[PDB]
């Protein structure tokens, strides 16, 4: 559960959802990484669930990284009410993603266990993804 | 095993044969590791007993005139070299074979000529 402390304005427009990624397109820091292809949004709950999933399988050794943060908010008004008449309230936070961006990275000398854990993580997210290696 | 390993083994067995006065061929099938270790301990005083593969030994035999043994390498083969003396190793193998009943002596090599099982028995007795 990662939440930003404060923001100048507490709500914004819908996230931009077109184009191809520009920066952070190369796996770097550790030895293995994950990159996505489709376009969607990811939230703190999903991030934490994926982190716990990778944790409970990596167990003793290794250590992870996260390259995103759901800071941009989204709004949702009380249910069963006439639309309009004012904004709703911010309920859950998300961060956008574009093809080529790197989501997670890992370092663990046992390649097979590392790959199996990473596949466990991939089978989790709501976006198509695949594993990548540090070497070109 | 790599081709380099095969060449190294060929050279090793060739030099061992060159440095050994004579040698014999036996069958190692159906023998328990305990009895193999016992035989190795018994023979270690004078001779050396190992295992070699048919194709490798056939290729290595081209150096000397031991090429006549090619027909005796059909099936499992165990190779024993006698660096010292000639007869004591033969007696040891004969007694071990007649005790175990699971070892058959394929033949031997003496004075540049292959000799059959009866000749091996006679020369061992001598």
């Amino acid at each position: 559960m990662l939440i930003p402390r404060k923001v100048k304005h507490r709500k914004q427009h819908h996230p931009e959802q077109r184009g191809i990624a520009s920066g952070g397109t190369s796996v770097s820091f550790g030895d293995y990484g994950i990159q996505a292809l489709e376009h969607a949004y990811i939230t703190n709950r999903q991030i934490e669930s994926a982190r716990i999933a990778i944790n409970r399988h990596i167990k003793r050794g290794g250590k992870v990284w996260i390259n995103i943060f759901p800071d941009r908010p989204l709004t949702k008004k009380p249910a069963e009410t006439r639309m309009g008449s004012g904004k709703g309230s911010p309920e859950w936070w998300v961060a956008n993603v574009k093809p080529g961006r790197v989501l997670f990275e890992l370092s663990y000398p046992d390649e097979k266990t590392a790959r199996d854990a990473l596949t466990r993580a991939i089978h989790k997210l709501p976006i198509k993804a695949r594993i990548v290696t540090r070497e070109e | 095993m790599a081709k380099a390993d095969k060449a190294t083994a060929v050279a090793d067995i060739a030099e061992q044969f060159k440095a050994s006065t004579a040698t014999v061929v036996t069958e190692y099938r159906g023998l328990t590791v305990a009895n193999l270790a016992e035989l190795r301990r018994a023979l270690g005083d004078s001779a050396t007993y190992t295992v070699a593969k048919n194709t490798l030994v056939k290729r290595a035999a081209s150096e000397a005139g031991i090429e006549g043994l090619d027909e005796l390498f059909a099936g499992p083969t165990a190779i024993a070299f006698v660096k010292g003396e000639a007869v004591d190793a033969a007696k040891a193998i004969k007694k071990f074979a007649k005790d175990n009943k699971a070892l058959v002596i394929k033949g031997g090599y003496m004075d540049g000529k292959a000799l059959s099982v009866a000749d091996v028995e006679k020369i061992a007795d001598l």
Binding site: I20, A21, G61, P99, S107, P109, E136 | -
Partner: protein, 192 residues
Amino acid sequence: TANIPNKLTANVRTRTGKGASRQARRDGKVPAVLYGHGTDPQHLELNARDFAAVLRSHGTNAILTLDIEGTEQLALTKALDVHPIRRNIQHADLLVVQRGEKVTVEVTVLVEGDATPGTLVTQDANTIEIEAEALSIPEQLTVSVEGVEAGTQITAGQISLPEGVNLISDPELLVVNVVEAPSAEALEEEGA
């Protein structure tokens, strides 16, 4: 530490523009431009297949000798661009060079060895800048780690280098770090 040139062929581009460039790309040709102190830019084509072969054989940085209309030249692959998704070589930069020049080249570094059970291996920096002669560029650098404990910060300067090379990056740069293996409690605490 000596290497040998890799031979290739090239042709002069007839048209300049995105349309023709990516038409050639689809056909199977990778456009390229060469330039240097000679003050004479030239833009050519290269065979993608042999280009990839040479790169995979001799790393990112390799010595290339090019045949253009019967003329010979020596060039270096200064920079490369890779499609993030398709991993294609859209364009490569060639820098002419003659024997006996000082050039700035980025070189990768690898690490190998055995680590104690109570230690973990991390690599903050994967490439280190090294200056040397054009024909004397190492293909890779290696560092051996054995029986290290606790803080064993290895600086770039500490790394052994071959002769005829100079370390341009400041020695204070940290390349390899080794730390105490983590604990489950602290690891789970992280990011809470």
